[PDB]
Design a protein around this ligand. Structure first.
Ligand SMILES: [Ca+2]
Lengths: 336, 316
């Protein structure tokens, strides 16, 4: 009947753009009800290692979550806010589709990349050691179970979203044991799903290739660090972090779709924020939930409002206010 | 006069062939001691005597080890005729070349739990930040940006970024910025013109070298250099596995000849350096002969032959 989504508006422009997403959803009469929570880490017993229980509990019930931009904490020992969110819900896959927006003139047209990044291991592991004076050691660890899990996820995502190819990105010529095991677990999944065409490329080669001719890529799966940087590279191909959606799949059917751009508080509260990032993420969310007919319209109207050009926000080069932008999309979906 | 020549893998021997031909055409007064591919000692002593080499492509890094080629310089600079989605670009990528995850420190701590060590030390961190600022002034560059992921790798990159900020104060004439790698990568493809001189650790230099090279025209045209405290070896800038090992008489010599000109400018035969450089850049601009990688239909010696025709005509 009606689905309740956990909604984390966050900081800065976040509550502005999340009201836009709510109103636009209401405009399209989407069976979505919102449950507003905040996730700013509270100081746990003797430290700071936990998010609010009401947040945990709400996301465990609702399974779906929409997250705006979060302020970078300034507390002394405070950890990364997405780190905590990653550990408490075991968000192991970070999906980032990059498709050129027809109404946004960029030097790259006709790009349709999905980067599947492993979010739990890799160079982004907690382990770092001072070995002796002025000599620091950082631990990258690859496990078989985590690799197979992300590999398995990448192929499943190609199946459900009708993508023809999976490409495994690695540097196994340098890190032959660690990345090698990522490659070989990717290969094992690949042999099980021969309906998906599978290849392997080297990270460095991909970046060179991506910048020249991005039309040659479909889905790309890779260990943590490579994903973190190559996902921002492809973003820069279509417009930047203002227009890229991003989801995070975790354990127990928990998924948190998020905007990845800054909290940008220099325009905060001035009705000038561009909410298309969050909204496109909310489309992924609606697609993840099976509301394809609601997603198709909402996504279709946002694409239109941009191709039109009348209503555009300062950041995309236009002069209009968020409120105007949000209203055109609302008025555009109602007749749909 | 004497230069050590390592032809290397794949088309390396073919590429270096073109360099010798151009040098004969330009009457360049350098004799190359070809060493083909333990064996490193012979090369090492050649370097100790010559102090300058040109090379193609724990594999070869043990060479970098031995000759302490700690700094890698890559010039990304759009060529006037060769048109790309990013024109009029001019950056230089300084990359520390010996540390990081490149020493093959890897083990199994449990079944299917591989652990991989990344090392970074204060010695080499400083050494490249100093080198970077030296470079920037000695070439007139405005600012240098230090690329890092110090919000995640707090100890390692943090130690790198710290040394950078320590050297940045002894060079007040040059602006100093810091940028996080995943952002710095996005920025290079939206607007690369905000950058001047980049300095990074080993792995990030592998990413940005090849990403930057694509901005300017690809592995076929982007040159590079690696410096020691005494030696200077000249090579290509984009060194990804499939850089140009694919083909025969198809490869684009543009990258090595421009690297060979840079080598001559290091040898202070700044005459031939500027001649060969100009010969290469104009042949490209006129746009008659262009190899396949540049969207033309031209064999490698076709390009090389016309380059010499132009360079011999400049001589007379
Ligand atoms: Ca990122």
């Amino acid at each position: 009947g009606v689905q309740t989504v956990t909604l984390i508006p966050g900081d800065g422009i976040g509550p502005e753009i999340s009201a836009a997403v709510m109103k636009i959803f209401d405009a399209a009469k989407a069976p979505i009800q919102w449950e507003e929570r905040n996730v700013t880490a509270i100081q746990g017993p003797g430290g700071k290692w936990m998010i609010p229980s009401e947040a945990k509990e709400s996301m465990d019930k609702n399974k779906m979550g929409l997250k705006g931009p979060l302020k970078t904490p300034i507390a002394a020992g405070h950890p990364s806010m997405n780190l905590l969110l990653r550990k408490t819900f075991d968000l192991y896959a970070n999906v980032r589709p990059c498709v050129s927006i027809e109404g946004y003139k960029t030097p790259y047209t006709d790009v349709n990349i999905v980067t599947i990044r492993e979010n739990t291991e890799g160079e982004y592991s907690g382990i770092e050691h001072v070995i002796v004076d002025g000599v620091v050691q950082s631990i990258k660890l690859i496990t078989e179970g985590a690799s197979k899990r992300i590999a398995e996820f990448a192929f499943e995502y190609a199946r459900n979203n009708h993508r023809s190819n999976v490409t495994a990105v690695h540097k196994a010529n340098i890190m032959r044991m660690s990345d090698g095991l990522f490659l070989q677990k990717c290969r094992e999944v690949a042999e099980s799903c021969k309906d998906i065409k599978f290849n392997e490329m080297y990270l460095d080669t991909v970046c060179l290739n991506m910048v020249q001719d991005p039309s040659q890529f479909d889905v790309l799966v890779m260990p943590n660090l490579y994903g973190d940087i190559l996902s921002d590279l492809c973003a820069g191909l279509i417009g930047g972090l203002g227009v890229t959606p991003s989801g995070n799949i975790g354990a127990n059917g928990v998924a948190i779709f998020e905007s990845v751009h800054g909290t940008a508080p220099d325009i905060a509260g001035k009705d000038m924020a561009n909410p298309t990032a969050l909204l496109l993420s909310a489309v992924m969310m609606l697609r993840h939930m099976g509301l394809f007919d609601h997603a198709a319209r909402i996504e279709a109207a946002c694409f239109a409002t941009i191709k039109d050009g009348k209503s555009l926000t300062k950041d995309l080069g236009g002069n209009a206010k968020c409120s105007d932008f949000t209203e055109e999309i609302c008025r555009r979906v109602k007749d749909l | 006069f004497p230069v050590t020549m390592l032809p290397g893998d794949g088309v390396g021997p073919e590429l270096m062939h073109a360099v010798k031909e151009v040098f004969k055409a330009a009457a360049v007064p350098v004799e190359f001691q070809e060493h083909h591919l333990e064996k490193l000692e012979q090369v090492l002593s050649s370097m100790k005597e010559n102090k300058v080499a040109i090379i193609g492509k724990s594999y070869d890094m043990r060479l970098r080890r031995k000759l302490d080629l700690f700094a890698n310089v890559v010039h990304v600079k759009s060529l006037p005729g060769y048109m790309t989605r990013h024109n009029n670009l001019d950056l230089v990528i300084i990359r520390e070349q010996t540390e990081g995850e490149y020493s093959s420190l890897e083990h199994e701590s449990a079944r299917g739990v591989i652990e991989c060590l990344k090392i970074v030390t204060r010695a080499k961190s400083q050494r490249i930040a100093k080198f970077a600022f030296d470079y920037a002034t000695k070439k007139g560059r405005g600012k240098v940006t230090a690329v890092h992921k110090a919000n995640i790798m707090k100890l390692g990159d943090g130690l790198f970024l710290q040394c950078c900020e320590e050297v940045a104060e002894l060079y007040p004439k040059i602006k100093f910025e810091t940028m996080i790698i995943d952002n710095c990568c996005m920025q290079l493809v939206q607007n690369p013109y905000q950058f001047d001189v980049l300095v990074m650790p080993n792995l990030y230099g592998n990413i940005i070298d090849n990403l930057a090279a694509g901005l300017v025209g690809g592995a076929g045209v982007v040159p590079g250099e690696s410096y020691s405290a005494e030696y200077a070896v000249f090579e290509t800038g984009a060194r990804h596995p499939f850089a140009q090992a694919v083909g025969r008489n198809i490869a684009n010599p543009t990258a090595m000849l421009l690297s060979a000109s840079n080598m001559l400018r290091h040898l202070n035969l700044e005459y031939h350096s500027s001649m060969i450089a100009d010969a290469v850049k104009k042949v490209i601009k006129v746009g008659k002969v262009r190899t396949s990688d540049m969207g033309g239909y031209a064999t490698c010696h076709d390009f090389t032959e016309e380059i010499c025709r132009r360079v011999k005509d400049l001589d007379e």
